Amino acid sequence: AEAWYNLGNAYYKQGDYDEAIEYYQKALELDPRSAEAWYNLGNAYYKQGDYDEAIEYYQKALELDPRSAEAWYNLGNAYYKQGDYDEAIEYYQKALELDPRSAEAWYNLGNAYYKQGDYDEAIEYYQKALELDPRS
């Protein structure tokens, strides 16, 4: 499994997401235990624009390891990209509960409320982002 995984990683690093997907899938067939590997497979689908696949593999990562702020955040991002703003909000909140340090994540939670048309919460979360990083 580890060898196929590392070949997927090398393709991923040069932006060959369809090859990364084929080799990650072969790795996971041999050993499905790593939350990180399912997360990397989700990322490959996300980079290709196949958000429904990214969601299925991020969910599998989080079933294995639910304290990954990064997996919750990317899950939120995949729902955001489908226009599922209510889900993005839920998973962004879960991410920020685990790790409130990223200005960018507070901003994206603000963006999801804005897209819902809930301007109060958009302002609340944009203000949290700008307190952390006022440069954009």
Ligand SMILES: [Tb+3]
């Ligand atoms: Tb290719």
Ligand SMILES: [Tb+3]
């Ligand atoms: Tb596609």
Ligand SMILES: [Tb+3]
């Ligand atoms: Tb699909």
